[PDB]
């Protein structure tokens, strides 16, 4: 998922570290998620995305129209971040030719877990 | 990895490949199902839905409680709209209290003989919903009567740790004096 970041929200994530990997997406990547697993949730129905009209159909409403608004809205937020995100259908990535290993736990403190930050892209990319 | 369902495969609840043995209904529903959805009318849909339930779930309604409804007309408008449409998916039973009450139009499943007549006779109109709908598509100056529910007796027979909070009558065997009711109506034995 995408996350808006402010202190609690920094905090819920703060606790959860060896169960998650998280970090700082990249525009490339973001776009790319936007390709790979691009879906919206549409009165339910999980539907891989298609076009900026639907996007508008959902998000004309924050005068978003297209994914480049969306990505923009990702990188550059809007605080329609929420709004945008919530109508997403949840992203499901891939097995990634780069296991986690060391029997889990954080990157330095294990495997991998915790914040891969910029290294998330690096990581994520083999995973999408 | 699936995860919590808030209850899995969501329960009958309000129901679907549906209920009772009267033929007509079966039509009705076909008729109406188009109408609410595909003649975009909450009222219709409602109707449609409302049609669907079971008998309890269609416990009747009766007339004087409609009187009021036709006091509503009366505090409605000066009166450009000057007409009004009652619905009941049950039988309309007669009431009693008034029974000199005016005429008017009621759209019901069934009107008792007596009622039917007398209503109609009083200038009323008993229209069946075929006799409604058709010639009544879309609401507006419609009046859903959603029946009642409550005043059944059954619920009476819900409650018995007879604390000062619970005041409710059991399904027991005294139909007269004692026979399971010896105190409470005295404070003392087996307390409260």
């Amino acid at each position: 998922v995408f996350v808006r970041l402010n202190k609690p929200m920094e905090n819920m994530l703060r606790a959860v570290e060896p169960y998650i990997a998280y970090g700082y997406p990249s525009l490339s990547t973001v776009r790319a998620m936007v390709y790979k697993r691009g879906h919206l949730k549409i009165n339910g129905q999980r539907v891989k995305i298609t076009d900026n009209q639907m996007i508008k159909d959902k998000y004309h409403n924050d005068d978003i129209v297209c994914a480049e608004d969306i990505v923009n809205q990702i990188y550059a937020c809007g605080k329609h971040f929420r709004t945008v995100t919530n109508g997403l259908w949840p992203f499901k990535l891939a097995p990634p030719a780069g296991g986690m290993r060391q029997k889990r736990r954080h990157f330095v403190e294990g495997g991998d877990y915790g914040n891969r930050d910029t290294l998330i892209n690096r990581f994520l990319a083999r995973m999408i | 990895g699936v995860d919590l369902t808030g209850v899995q495969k969501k329960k009958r609840v309000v129901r679907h490949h549906t209920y009772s043995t009267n033929p007509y209904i079966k039509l009705l529903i076909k008729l109406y199902k188009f109408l609410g959805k595909r003649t975009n009318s909450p009222f219709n849909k409602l109707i449609h839905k409302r049609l669907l339930k079971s008998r309890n779930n269609r416990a009747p309604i009766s007339l004087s409680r409609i009187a009021v409804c036709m006091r509503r007309r009366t505090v409605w408008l000066k009166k450009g709209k000057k007409s009004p449409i009652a619905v009941i998916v049950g039988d309309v039973l007669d009431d009693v209290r008034m029974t000199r009450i005016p005429a008017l139009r009621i759209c019901a499943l069934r009107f008792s003989k007596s009622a039917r007549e007398r209503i109609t006779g009083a200038g009323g109109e008993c229209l069946t919903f075929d006799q409604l709908a058709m010639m009544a598509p879309t609401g507006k100056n419609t009046m859903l009567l959603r029946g009642r529910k409550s005043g059944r007796e059954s619920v009476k027979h819900f409650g018995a740790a007879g604390v000062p909070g619970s005041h409710a009558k059991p399904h027991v065997s005294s139909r007269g004096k004692e026979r399971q009711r010896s105190s409470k109506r005295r404070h003392a034995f087996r307390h409260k």
Binding site: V34, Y35, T50, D51, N52, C66, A67, E68 | -
Partner: protein
Amino acid sequence: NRRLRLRLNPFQKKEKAMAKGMQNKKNREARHAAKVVRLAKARKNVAK
């Protein structure tokens, strides 16, 4: 799938058509940059 891709960025076809600037363009940069920093470089110098 240029089409949906193109839905999503229409500059993209023309980008693609023109590599978003190929090779000559891609080899040209450094060399300016390299002198340029030296010009910048050069300025502070004496004023230390």
